[PDB]
From a paper:
In this report, we show the hypothetical protein [name], which had previously been detected in the host cell cytosol is a T3S effector and we identify a novel putative chaperone protein for this effector. Our results converge to identify [name] as a secreted protein that plays multiple and crucial roles in the initiation and support of the [name] growth cycle. In order to gain more insights into the molecular mechanism of [name] function during Chlamydia infection, we undertook a structural analysis of [name], the [name] ortholog in the strain [name] L2 434/Bu. [name] is the first chlamydial effector identified to date whose genetic disruption has such a strong impact on bacterial development in cell culture, without being fully lethal.
Indeed, LC-MS/MS analysis (data not shown) of the excised bands suggested that two unique CTL0886FL domains were present spanning residues 94–334 (CTL0886N) and residues 353–651 (CTL0886C). While equally poor diffraction was initially obtained with CTL0886C crystals, reductive methylation of surface exposed lysines enabled the growth of cubic crystals that diffracted synchrotron X-rays to 1.90 Å resolution. The structure of CTL0886C was determined using selenomethionine-labeled recombinant protein (also dimethylated) by Se-SAD and refined against the native high-resolution dataset. The final model is comprised of a single polypeptide in the asymmetric unit, 1 sulfate anion and 98 water molecules. The CTL0886C structure is comprised of 13 α-helices spanning two separate domains. Domain 1 consists of helices α1–7 arranged in a 7 helix bundle (residues 353–517). Helices α8–13 of domain 2 adopt an intertwined, globular fold with the later 3 helices (α11–13) wrapping around helices α8–10. Upon inspection of the 2Fo-Fc electron density map, four lysine residues (446, 463, 490, and 579) were modeled as dimethyl-lysine. For domain 1, each of these structures (as well as the next 10 scoring hits) are all members of the polyprenyl transferase (PTS) family. CTL0886C domain 1 is, however, lacking several α-helices typically found within the PTS family, including those involved in dimerization and extended regions typically found within the active site of PTS family enzymes (e.g., Asp-rich motifs).
Residue numbers in the entry: 353 to 427, 430 to 522, 531 to 589, 598 to 650
The structure:
């Protein structure tokens, strides 16, 4: 009876290819369906057979994915819950601790829940906000994690971030429009929001810095951030024009950053959700 944290490379790649094959069975751009859930099950069984044989005992983490897919067929939360269990398993294969696999699972599951949220939902803004918190948490964890946990994160989170988006004086409103203008997917939104977040963080941490230095440092940070990079650099340059261009703009940006930064980013998220939702 096999334990996933104690697998050889051939079986690690078998498992991960099975997870990748499950992922190809759905389309995040439309509500999840019985057919997709069933197809994921068929891919899971094909990989399980390779792992332990048509009759061997399923490892705990594969058991969990099976249970999850079973429930989702009986009743969005369903596919999202199953993909969190996929990300847990993949994280365990990669040598992650229980705590790490748990964090990966909770936060990947959230990205799918955000991907499947309708823009008309009363909870859409919330879901967009929760999805950014999950994004950040995953990017933090990615950096400090073993390679296989990195693969578990990116391979399960990316499909949710691929969800398409499209649009329907105040700085937070101006930032929202700038992010949205340059974004096709949810991943585009969050990666560009993170650039703004980093711009604000750079100002706070370097209050004496002028425009050129702020941008120099931000550029370095974007180069050192976890994983298109040229596109985020180009986006940084677009933020420069809006919020760092000249002494007046910088002074405005410095007030928001020193005095309001979390509130500002959450107001930006509200305004981004408004642009996708049409609602105030």
């Amino acid at each position: 009876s096999l334990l996933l944290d104690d697998v050889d490379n051939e079986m690690a790649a078998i498992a991960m290819q099975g997870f990748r094959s499950m992922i190809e069975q759905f389309n995040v751009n439309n509500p999840a369906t019985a057919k997709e859930l069933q197809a994921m099950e068929a891919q899971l069984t094909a990989m399980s057979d390779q792992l332990v044989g048509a009759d061997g005992e399923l490892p705990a983490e594969i058991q969990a994915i099976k249970d999850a897919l079973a429930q989702a067929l009986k009743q969005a939360d369903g596919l999202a819950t199953a993909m969190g269990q996929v990300a847990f398993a993949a994280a365990k294969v990669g040598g992650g601790s229980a705590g790490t696999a748990g964090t990966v699972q909770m936060n990947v599951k959230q990205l799918y829940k955000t991907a499947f949220s309708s823009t008309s939902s009363s909870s859409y803004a919330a879901a967009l906000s929760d999805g950014y918190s999950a994004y950040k948490t995953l990017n933090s964890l990615y950096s400090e994690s073993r390679s296989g946990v990195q693969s578990a994160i990116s391979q399960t989170a990316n499909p949710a971030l691929s969800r398409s988006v499209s649009r329907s004086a105040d700085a937070s409103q101006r930032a929202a429009e700038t992010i949205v203008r340059d974004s096709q997917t949810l991943g585009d939104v969050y990666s560009r929001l993170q650039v703004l977040d980093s711009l604000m963080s750079t100002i706070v941490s370097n209050p004496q810095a002028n425009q050129e230095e702020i941008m120099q440092k931000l550029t370095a940070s974007i180069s050192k951030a976890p994983q298109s990079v040229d596109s985020l650099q180009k986006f940084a340059a677009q933020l420069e024009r809006e919020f760092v261009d000249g002494e007046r703009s910088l002074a405005e940006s410095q007030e928001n950053a020193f005095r309001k930064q979390p509130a500002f980013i959450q107001q930006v998220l509200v305004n981004i959700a408004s642009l996708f939702s049409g609602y105030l």
